[PDB]
Structure formats: structure tokens, C-alpha cells
Amino acid sequence: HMCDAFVGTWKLVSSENFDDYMKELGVGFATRKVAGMAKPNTIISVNGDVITLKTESTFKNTEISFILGQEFDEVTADDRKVKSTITLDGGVLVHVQKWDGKSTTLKRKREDDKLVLELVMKGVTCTRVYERA
């Protein structure tokens, strides 16, 4: 029952500082424009110990499957080749990506009826709020 509160289909409702976050990742002008326009859905499912997280939009579709604590190689929506580990820390799903001496964190928490995604790179924090579809 590790991740029960996260399971389902979620839709983006608000975004704060995403452009700045994408700049910190090195995302170029055209991609930042088209990515910022996106209204994704995030679909989280669980089969035993395997969690699947899909992110679907008109810009890109991504899909990762993982076991908590077990590192995996990920190719992100902006085409970074990263080493990823996802853990549950006190009810928060913490996703760390490492590449090229750099790191970013993607943390997901349940707050009221929302799924709140915090993206942090260096000094920059973006918050993406999702609600159930």
C-alpha cells in the first residue's frame, strides 16, 4: 500500500516558475515556449513493487517504471540522459536525477485533494499543482 494516495489520473491545474526551472536545465527558447503551453496529465499506477508514472501532453509523452530505492537510467522529456532514483520519504515521493555533475529533485506530495510537484534545480524552485481528472 506504499503509494496508494498517488495512484490515478491527475491533470495540471497551475504552474509557478516553470520557465525559470527549464532555463536552469538548459532548455532552449522554442522548447520552453511549447512546453510551458502544455497541459499534461500524470498517470500513476502500481503493480506489486513496480510503480509506473506516465506524463502525457501534446508536447511529449513520457513513461517510467521503477522500484523504490533502485536506480534506473531515464531519458527525460527534454532529452537529458540521467541516473534516477525514486524513494518514499515520509509520504513524499522523492525523485532525484543526476547527470553531468548536476542534480535536480522532483518531489510529489499529497496536500488536500492535490498532487503537488516541487521541481528544484540549484536555487530555482517550480511548483506544479495537479488535481484528479
Ligand X SMILES: CCCCCCCCCCCCCCCC(=O)O
**Binding positions for ligand X, rule: CB under 6 A:** 22, 27, 31, 35, 38, 40, 42, 55, 57, 59-60, 76-78, 117, 128
Q: Which is nearer to ligand X, 93 or 128 (CB)?
A: 128
Query: Least separation, in Å, of the C-beta of 132 and ligand X?
Result: 15
Q: Which is nearer to ligand X, 48 or 62 (CB)?
A: 62
- Confirm whether residue 130 is marked as ligand binding: yes
Query: Least separation, in Å, of the C-beta of 21 and ligand X?
Result: 7
Q: Which is nearer to ligand X, 5 or 48 (CB)?
A: 5
Q: Which is nearer to ligand X, 57 or 68 (CB)?
A: 57
Residue type, 15: S
C-alpha 63/C-alpha 54 separation (Å) is 4
| Residue 6: strand, helix, or coil | helix
C-alpha 3/C-alpha 44 separation (Å) is 9
Q: CA torsion angle for 98, 127, 66, 132 (degrees, to 10)?
A: -170
Q: Mention every residue, 6+ apart, whose C-beta is less than 8 A from residue 69.
A: 85, 86, 87
- Confirm whether residue 96 is marked as ligand binding: no
C-alpha 112/C-alpha 1 separation (Å) is 19
- Confirm whether residue 21 is marked as ligand binding: no
* Binding-site positions: 128-130
**Residues comprising the binding site for a fatty acid?**
128-130
